[PDB]
Amino acid sequence: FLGLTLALSKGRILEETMPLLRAAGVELLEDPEASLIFPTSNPNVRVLILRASDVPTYVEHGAADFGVAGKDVLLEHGANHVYELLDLKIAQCKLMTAGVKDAPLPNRRLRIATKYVNVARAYFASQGQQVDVIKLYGSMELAPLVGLGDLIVDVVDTGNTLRANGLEARDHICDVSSRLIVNQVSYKRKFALLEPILDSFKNSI
């Protein structure tokens, strides 16, 4: 396959990018959610659907030429071997520290339980606070409630999921929005195919 391969996350990202994609002459032929590789109206573009945390991995290694993934994933995964061309202002949220409702931080050293391990260490380093970090792959709302960690680091838009599990947002780490990333080789080699699509997206924004 000599054209572009686009890396995409199922659900929230796919849906919020399709208006930019349609405007760039890229419409998927089937609906992803309706039951791995997808064609598009442009024959020189195709789409890969994966978990949002694997988008940077597929892009940096070049198994996809470019992709859309949240800045939460790029910060956590490290975006060393990709180019971050465009802030797409879609799928917006924030990385925040969260704890149990109104309970104060305990006397002893803080335990943070989180997916975002490197984000946590980096943040709490910037706030001069020494912590123990515990890696979770699954949903993290449970961790405070059984004292696995005192706080967590997670994405929050409204905070309904946080309140629904008896938690509350505490500190604002940074803002989050999905970004357009491009494999470093693919940007040099296939720029001719990329330039229009980048211009459409950029116009759309």
Partner 1 sequence: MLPDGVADVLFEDAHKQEVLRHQLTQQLITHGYQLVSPPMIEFTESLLSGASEDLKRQTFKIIDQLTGRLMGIRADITPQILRIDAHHGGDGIARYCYAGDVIHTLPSGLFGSRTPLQLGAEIFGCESIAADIELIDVLFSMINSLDMSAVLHVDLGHVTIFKRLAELAALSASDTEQLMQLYANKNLPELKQVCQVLPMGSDFYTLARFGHDIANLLGRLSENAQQDTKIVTAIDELQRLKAHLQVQWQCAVSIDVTELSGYHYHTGIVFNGYINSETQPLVRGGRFDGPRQATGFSMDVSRLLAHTQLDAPFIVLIDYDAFNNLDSAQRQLLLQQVASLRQQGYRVTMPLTAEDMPVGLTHRLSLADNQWRLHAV
- Provide the binding-site residues for a second copy, judged by CB under 8 A: 5, 36-37, 48, 50-51, 53-54, 57-58, 61, 63-64, 134-139, 141-143, 145-148, 165
From its phi and psi, is residue 109 left (phi > 0), alpha (psi between -120 and 50) or beta? beta
d(CA 32, CA 37): 9
Spatial neighbors of 200 by CB under 8 A, at least 6 apart, are: 20, 23, 24, 25
What is the C-alpha radius of gyration for the chain, rounded to an integer number of angstroms?
Answer: 19
Out of a second copy, ligand ADP, ligand PRP, none, what residue 159 binds, judged by CB under 5 to 8 A for its kind, is ligand PRP
* Binder of ligand PRP out of 138, 158, 188, 192 (CB under 6 A): 158
Shortest approach of ligand ADP to residue 141 CB, angstroms? 13
Shortest approach of a second copy to residue 80 CB, angstroms? 15
d(CA 90, CA 72): 13
Q: Closer CB to ligand PRP, residue 142 or residue 194?
A: 142
Q: Is 92 in the site for ligand PRP (CB under 6 A)?
A: no
d(CA 128, CA 72): 21
Shortest approach of ligand ADP to residue 52 CB, angstroms? 3
Shortest approach of partner 1 to residue 156 CB, angstroms? 22
Length of the chain: 205
d(CA 186, CA 16): 24
Q: Is 195 in the site for ligand PRP (CB under 6 A)?
A: no
d(CA 44, CA 26): 10
Which residues bind to partner 1, rule: CB under 8 A? 60-62, 79-87, 107-109, 111, 121, 124-125, 128-132, 179, 182, 184-189, 191, 202, 205
Which residues bind to ligand PRP, rule: CB under 6 A? 139, 154-162
